[PDB]
Ligand binder design. Structure first.
Ligand SMILES: C/C=C/c1cc2c(s1)[C@@H](O)[C@H](O)C[C@]2(O)C(=O)O
Ligand SMILES: C/C=C/c1cc2c(s1)[C@@H](O)[C@H](O)C[C@]2(O)C(=O)O
Ligand SMILES: C/C=C/c1cc2c(s1)[C@@H](O)[C@H](O)C[C@]2(O)C(=O)O
Ligand SMILES: C/C=C/c1cc2c(s1)[C@@H](O)[C@H](O)C[C@]2(O)C(=O)O
Ligand SMILES: C/C=C/c1cc2c(s1)[C@@H](O)[C@H](O)C[C@]2(O)C(=O)O
Ligand SMILES: C/C=C/c1cc2c(s1)[C@@H](O)[C@H](O)C[C@]2(O)C(=O)O
Ligand SMILES: C/C=C/c1cc2c(s1)[C@@H](O)[C@H](O)C[C@]2(O)C(=O)O
Ligand SMILES: C/C=C/c1cc2c(s1)[C@@H](O)[C@H](O)C[C@]2(O)C(=O)O
Ligand SMILES: C/C=C/c1cc2c(s1)[C@@H](O)[C@H](O)C[C@]2(O)C(=O)O
Ligand SMILES: C/C=C/c1cc2c(s1)[C@@H](O)[C@H](O)C[C@]2(O)C(=O)O
Ligand SMILES: C/C=C/c1cc2c(s1)[C@@H](O)[C@H](O)C[C@]2(O)C(=O)O
Ligand SMILES: C/C=C/c1cc2c(s1)[C@@H](O)[C@H](O)C[C@]2(O)C(=O)O
Lengths: 153, 152, 152, 152, 153, 152, 153, 153, 152, 152, 152, 152
C-alpha cells in the first residue's frame, strides 16, 4: 500500500535550525527511520515523501491522492495547521484516511498554535513525540488500512 | 468585453467529491453553462477561466488584469475568502468590478466561514445558489459594465 | 407561479433620503423594474409587493404564505436582518424558497451589520448590487421553482 | 384566579410546520390540554389565551394585566426571549408573577438561544418538556398565588 | 416650530410602576411640564406627544417627520435604544435634528443598557436627570433650530 | 417507577444557611414534599434520595442507574451544573430520562451561573420555583415515562 | 451657590486646534457664555473654572469640594473619562452632585471612547451639543441644588 | 518497567453506552489488548490499570507514582481534561513521563472539548484513533523510557 | 478559639517537587511553623490541619465547621481556587471567617490562575509570600475573631 | 531598615467618605497604628509615609527609593492598580521588595477592579482585611528583609 | 529645525535598572548620540530634551509646541503608549509631525503592550532597535520637515 | 554586507494603483533610493531585491539566506504580516537579523492589520514613513551587523 508523507513549511530546516526546540534529527533522517520501520516490520507499505513551503503544493498533492495509487496520508502541515482552512477542506474532500503529526505539543506553546483547522479535519492527531510521532502515525495508518480492508471484504 | 472567472482552492474537485455539500456539477460543467448563457444571450462577453490552489497565482492573475484586456472579475476564492487579506488587497487595488460567488451560504455553516475579507473588498457578493450563482454574477457583471460605459 | 416581495424597515424611504448610500431609485421604481423583467421575459410569475416597518407584519406575511397561493419569497429585511431571530425562525418554518437581498454589501459596513440571522435561514443571499439585486433574485427564484416542479 | 397565557411569535404555526423540532400538537391543542388540567384538578383558575407575532402587542397585553383582573402571566416569548429587553422590562414593571415556558431546551440548541432577557425577569423558567411545560407552569402559578394570599 | 416628542416602550407606565427606579412623575405629567416650559419661555414651539410600545410605530412616526411640518424630534426609545438598528437607521435617514433622552444613567446600570444604537445616530444624548432631561432637550432643540435658521439666512 | 433524586453539593445545607437566597425548607423537608405529591396523586412511583458534595459519587450513582432498577433521574447538580462536563457526559451516556432542577433562577444571578453543561445534556430544565420545582419534575418524569411506554 | 466647572486634558486647546471636530468657540469663550447665562437668569450661582491636563489635579480639586464652599461640579474629564477609575472613585466619594459634559457624542466615535468610568459615577451625562451642553448642565445643576434644598427644608 | 494506565470519568462505560460515538470495545477489552501488545512484543513492561470518576483519586494515584515503582503514566482524563487544572498540576509535579490519550478527536467536537489543561502538561497527546491510541501510547512510552535509560548511562 | 487549616490539591507534594516554583519547606514544616507562631505568641488558638485532593472532602469539611467547635478557616484551595464554584458556595454558606492563602502570586502566572471563585467568597486573600503567608493569615484570623467577640 | 509606605489616589479621603465601603479609620490613624506595631515590637524599622493622587509622584517616589536609604515598599496604588502599567514598570525596575495592599477584596467588586498590573509586579499582595492589611504587610516586609540580609 | 525629544515614564532609569531588557546606555547617553548624529550629518537641527513620569507634563509640553518654535516631536511615551488616550489626543491636536519610538519590540512582549493609542496618532512608529531608533526618527523627521517645506 | 530586501504581495503594484494610500513612488524607484542611500554614505553593502505574491517563495528565499552569502533581511511582508505564522517561523529559524518595514502605520488602519506575526519575530519594526522606512532599516541593519562583528 502507498502512504504519502507530506511535510509542510519550514520542516526542511529540521536539525539545521533551532535544535533546542525541534531537535537534531533532520527531515531526511526521519524519513529513513520511517523506511527502516517498514523494512523491519515487513509492512506492505510504499512511502512517498514530499516537503513544501507552499500551501498550494500541499493541496495539489492531496488532490493527487485521488487515483487508486495512494491509500493514506501522514501530514505535518507546520504553521498552516493553524491558518489553512483551504488544506483542511482538501483533507475533508480527499475521503482517504489522513493523520496529523506535530513534533511539538501545540497545546503547550503560544496561544496562536492551539487551533488546528487541519487536525480537526483529520481522523487522528499525534503531537509532542518528536520524530517518533511519525513512526506512531505509520503504525496507526497500517492498522487503519488493514481494518478498512477487512471491512470491505 | 473580457470577463475573467477565477476559481480558488479545491473548486477543481467539484462534482468528484462531497456531492451532498457542493453538488454533482463539475467545474468544467459550470464553465460551459456560463458560456451557453453568453452565447444564447448574444452577450458581447469573452470569458476566461482560471482555477488554482495557490493564493499567489490568484494575486498574480488579478494584477495581470490591469492591462486593458480584462474589464471585470468574477471570483470564488474558496477558503481563501475567510483568511486572505492579501487577495482582498489585490481586489482593492485592481480598480475594476469584482463579484464574489460562493456555492454555499457561508452565513449558514461553521463560524470560521462567516468572515470574508475578499467579499468585503468586492462590490457585490452572491452565495447559496450553487452553480446558478455564477450565471447570476455574469448577468450582474454585464449590467455593471454596460452601465459603466454609458456613464463614461 | 406567485412570488412575494417583502421590503423591511426604512426601505420605503429609498430615493428620498441618503442617496449616496442607497441610491436614487425609489422602492416603487425597483418594483416596476421587477415587473418589466417578468413581462419582457414572458415569465409565468405573478409578483406581490409588501413593505413594512413592523417585524410582526413581516412574520404575519411569511405565515400567510403557507396556503398554496405563494411559491417563493424574495426578502430584504432591512435592519431586522441583523437582529430578528423571530423572522429567521419564520423563514425556517415557511417551508418554501426564500432569497435575501441587500442593496449594500453588509460585509463592508459597520461591524453590527455583518450578522444576518435571516440570511443564514435563507437558501441564498445577494448583496451589494443595488436595485439590480432584486432582478438577480427573480432570475434565481424562477430557476429554483422551475427546477423544483421538474423534480416533483 | 385569572391567568393570562401569552404565546409569542411563530407559536401559532405549531404542528403545522417543523413537527420534528416543535411537535405535532397545535397551539389550540395545548390550550385545551391546559383547560383539561385545570378541570381534572379543580383549580379555581380561568385561562385567557393570547398569541401574537408583535413585540408591542405582547407589551400592550402585559400592561393590560395592571387592573385587578389578571393575577399572573404564563409566557412563551418565542425568539423575543433572546432579543427583547423591552418585554423583559414590561415583565419587571408588571408586579405580578410571570413564568416563562419554552417547548425546547434552549440550553441545547444554537448559541444565540441561550440568552433569555425575559427569563431573567421572570420568577421561574421551564424548558424542554414540550406542551406539558405549560401545565407545569400552571401548577407553579396556582401555588405562587396561594403563597402570596396566605401572606396577605 | 413643531417638535415631536416620541416616548418608547414601557414609558406609559411611568409613575405607576417601579417609582423607586423611574420616579413618581407620570408621562402625562412630564408632557404638561414641557408645555409649561414653552408657555413660560414664550417659545415658538408646538409640541406633539406620541408614546408607543411598537418599534414599527416609532419608525412610521419618524418617517412622517418628512413633510415640512415637524422640525425636530426628542426621543426616549426605551429598551429599543439598545437593540433597534432599525430606529437608528430611521433617525439617520430623517435628516432633521434628533435628541435622545434617558431618565436614568444608562452607563450606570446593566451591561446590556450601555449600547445605544439610536443614541449614536442622534446629534446629542441626555441621561440620568429624570423628567428634567426632557426640558433640557427642549432648551437644546430650540437653540439648535434657531442656530440652523440663522445659518440658512 | 423507580425515580432517583440526586442532590448536588451544598444542598444538604438547605434551610440551615442563607435562608434569604435558598429558603428555610430543608433538603429532608423537600423529599417529604415529593412523597406527599406522589401519594396525593397516586403515582406508581418509588423515590430514592441521594445527596453528595462529590462529583464522582454523582457520576457513580448515575452509572448505577444502568440496571433496570431506576427508570429516570431528577437532578439538582448545584454548582457542578456550571463546571462539570464529566457529569454532563454521564447524563448523556445514561440513556434514561434526566430532568434538571434549580431552586433559583440561574438566568438571574451571577454571569458564571448561566452556563449549565448538565442542563444542556438533560431533557428539560426547571428553575426559580424553589422546592416546588422538584414536584414539577416528578409530574414531567411520570409523563415522559408514560409516553415512552405507550411507544413500547 | 458655588458651582465648580472642571475641564480636563486638551480642553484648553479648544477653538485653537481641530475646529472641524470640536468647534471654533474657545474654552475661555464657553466660560463667559456660562457666566452670561447666570447673569441673565439672575441665578444665585458663583462659578469657578479650572482646567488641567493632570489626573491628580482633577482629583485634588474634587476633594477640595469637601468644605461647605462648593455645592456642585460640572465636569468634562476629556480622555480621562474613558480611562480614569481614579477620577470615577473621587466622584463617587465626593457625595455632591456631579454632571458630566462632552462636546461630542462619545457613542458615535471610536470604540475606545464609548466607556466612561466617570460618567457612570455621575448623576447625569450630557453629550454632543458642543458648548451648549455646559449651559444645559448649569440649568440642570441649579434645578438639582434647589430641589435638594426644598427636600432638606 | 511499570506503566500506570489511568482511565478517567465515564470510561468504565465504554462499549456499553453510545457505541456510535466511543465504540463497541469495552475498557476491560482495551486493557487486554494492551497486555497482548506487551506479551507479543516481549516488552519489559508491567501494566497497572486504574479507572475512576473521581478527580481526587486520579491525583492521589499520580502522586503514588512518586516511589521508584512506576516509570510512566498513560492517561485518558476524560472530561477532566478540559476542566482540571488540579490534575494538570499533579502531572507537572510528577516529573515522570505522562502521555495523554483520547479516543475521539477533541479538536473536531464541541468547542468546550478543545482546551486540554492536562494535555498541555503532558509530553505528548494522541487523539482520534479509538482503542489503538492506547497501543500507540505504549509504543511511545517504551521508546521514551529506553531513551531516558540510555541517556542516564 | 479553634482554627481549621485546609490545604487543597497537590499541597502535600510541597518541598518534594518543583522547589524553584513552590519552595523547599514541606506541608508538615509549614504546619509546625504555624504551631510555633501560636505557642510562642501564647495565642488562645487551637489549630486543626486538613489536606486533600478531593473537592468534595473540602466541602464536607467546611460544612462540618458549622457546629460550635470551629471559629474560622484558613484555606489554600490550590487549583480549585480557579475552577470550584462549589467550594466558593460552601465558603459563602459557612457563615464564619475564611481567609484564602496562596504560596505564589496568582496575578503573576498563567492567565488561567487569575480567576479565584473561592477568594472572591473569602473576606481576605493573601498571595505570594510563600509559607509566611499562612502566619500572616493566623495573625489576621486572631485579630478578626478577637474583634468579633468584642463586638458581640 | 527604612520602609516607605505609599498611599495612592483617594486614600487621603479615608474615614471621611463612604465608611460602609472603606471603614471609619482615617489614613493618619492607619499610619499611627503601623508606628505602634513597630514600637511595641521593637522592630528596627523606620517608616516613611507618602500619599498622592498623582501617578507621576508615585513613580518619582519609587525611583527616589533607588539610593541606599529605603529597603522596601508597601504600596496601595488605589485605582491605579488596575490601570497603571507605568507604576507596574516602576515597581519592576525598583529592584527591591514591594508588597501591595488593598483595603477591600478586589476579586469581589466590579469586574474592572480584578486586573492589577501593579500587584502582578509585586512579590506579594494582601487584600480585604481593611487597615490590618498594612500591619500584615509590615510583618511580611520585616521577615522578608531579615531573611534577605542573612542570605547576603 | 527645533525638534523636541520627549521621554516618558521610567525612561530616566535607563542603564541604571534592568540592563538585560532595556540596555546599559543611559538616557543622557542616548541624547549625546542624537547630537553626534546631527553633527556628523550637518542637519540644521537644534534638539531639546524632556523627560517626565507625568502624563500631564507630557501633554503640557506637546501643547507648548504650538508656537512656531518647535517643528516636530520625537516621543517615547513609555507605558503611557498603551493607556493614554489623553496623550494620543494631544498628539492629534498638535498639528506638527510626531514620531514614536520604543527601545523594545512591543509586538514581542506582553499582550498589554501591543496596543499603542499614541502610536496610532503618530505619523510613524519605530520599535526594537534600542537607542538607534531615536536617530532613525531624526532621519525621518528631517525628511518629513523637508517635504513639508518643498510643498510650502 | 549582502542584504536581502524582500517585498511581499501587492507591493509590485506600488505607484500604479491607489496612490492616495501607498504613494506614487514605484517599487523599482524605492530600490534605486536604497542604492543611492548606500552610495551617499559609503556603506559596504550589496543589495539584492526580491518581490513575490507567494508566501512559499518568501519562505524559500528566507531559507536560502542560510549559506554565508546574505547577512541580513529587510522585509515588508505585505498582508502576510497579519496572517503568516509560517513566514514568522521562517524568520525565527533563520538566525540572521531581520527588520520589518511597512509603508503605512498599521496601528492606524483596520483592526485586522494591527496583528503582525512577522513583526513579532523580527528584531525591529518600522512603519508609517513610506519609502524612507527602507533606508531607515538599512541604517539599522548596517549598525546591527557592526555590533555583531565587534562582538565576534
Ligand atoms: C524545522 C521546523 C519544524 C516545525 C514544526 C512545526 C512548526 S515548525 C510550527 O510552524 C507548528 O506550529 C508546529 C510544528 O508543526 C511541529 O511541532 O511539528
Ligand atoms: C469542490 C470544493 C468547493 C468549495 C467551495 C467553497 C469551499 S470548497 C470553501 O472552502 C468555502 O468556505 C466556500 C466555497 O467558496 C463555496 O461555497 O463556494
Ligand atoms: C431606504 C433605506 C434602505 C435600507 C436598506 C438596508 C438598510 S436601510 C439597513 O438597515 C440594512 O443594514 C442594509 C439594507 O437591508 C440594504 O442594504 O438593503
Ligand atoms: C412553531 C414555533 C415554535 C417556537 C417555539 C420557540 C421558538 S419557535 C424559538 O424562536 C425559541 O428560540 C424557542 C421557543 O420559545 C420554544 O422552544 O418554545
Ligand atoms: C416606565 C418605564 C420607563 C423606562 C425608561 C427607560 C427604560 S424603561 C429602559 O427600557 C431603558 O433601558 C432606559 C430608559 O429609556 C430611561 O432611563 O429613560
Ligand atoms: C444550600 C445550597 C443550595 C444551592 C443550590 C444551588 C446552588 S447552592 C448553586 O451552587 C447553583 O448555582 C444553583 C443551585 O443549583 C440552585 O439554585 O438550586
Ligand atoms: C480641545 C479638545 C477637546 C476635547 C474634548 C473631548 C476630548 S478632547 C476627548 O479626549 C473625549 O473623548 C471627548 C471630549 O471630552 C468631548 O467631546 O468633550
Ligand atoms: C465511555 C466514555 C468515554 C469517554 C471518552 C472521552 C470522553 S467520555 C470525554 O468526556 C472527553 O471529552 C474525550 C474522551 O476523553 C475521549 O475521546 O477519550
Ligand atoms: C505542592 C503544590 C502546591 C501548589 C500550590 C498552589 C498550586 S499547586 C496551584 O494549583 C494554584 O494555582 C496556586 C497555589 O494555590 C499556591 O500558590 O498556593
Ligand atoms: C478613601 C478611598 C480608598 C480607596 C481604596 C481603594 C480604592 S479607593 C480603589 O480605587 C481600589 O480599586 C481599591 C483600593 O485600592 C483598596 O481597597 O484599598
Ligand atoms: C528604563 C525604562 C524604559 C522603558 C521603555 C519602555 C517601557 S519602560 C515600557 O513601559 C513600554 O512598554 C516600552 C518602552 O516604551 C520601550 O521599549 O521603549
Ligand atoms: C501596492 C501595495 C502595497 C501594500 C503595502 C502594504 C499592504 S499593501 C498591506 O497588505 C499591509 O497591511 C501593509 C503594507 O505592508 C504596508 O503598509 O507597507
Amino acid at each position: 500500500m502507498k502512504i504519502l508523507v507530506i511535510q509542510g513549511p519550514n520542516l526542511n530546516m529540521l536539525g539545521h535550525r533551532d535544535p533546542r526546540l525541534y531537535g537534531m534529527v533532520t527531515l531526511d533522517q526521519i524519513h529513513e527511520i520511517m523506511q527502516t520501520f517498514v523494512k523491519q516490520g515487513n509492512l506492505d507499505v510504499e512511502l512517498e515523501f514530499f516537503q513544501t513551503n507552499f500551501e498550494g503544493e500541499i493541496i495539489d498533492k492531496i488532490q493527487e491522492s485521488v487515483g487508486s495509487d495512494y491509500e493514506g496520508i501522514i501530514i505535518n502541515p507546520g504553521a498552516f495547521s493553524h491558518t489553512s482552512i483551504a488544506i483542511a477542506d482538501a483533507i475533508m474532500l480527499a475521503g482517504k484516511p489522513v493523520i496529523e503529526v506535530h513534533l511539538t505539543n501545540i497545546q503547550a506553546r503560544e496561544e496562536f498554535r492551539k487551533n488546528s483547522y487541519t487536525g480537526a479535519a483529520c481522523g487522528g492527531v499525534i503531537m509532542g513525540f518528536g520524530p517518533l510521532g511519525y513512526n506512531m502515525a505509520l503504525m496507526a495508518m497500517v492498522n487503519i488500512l488493514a481494518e478498512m480492508k477487512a471491512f470491505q471484504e
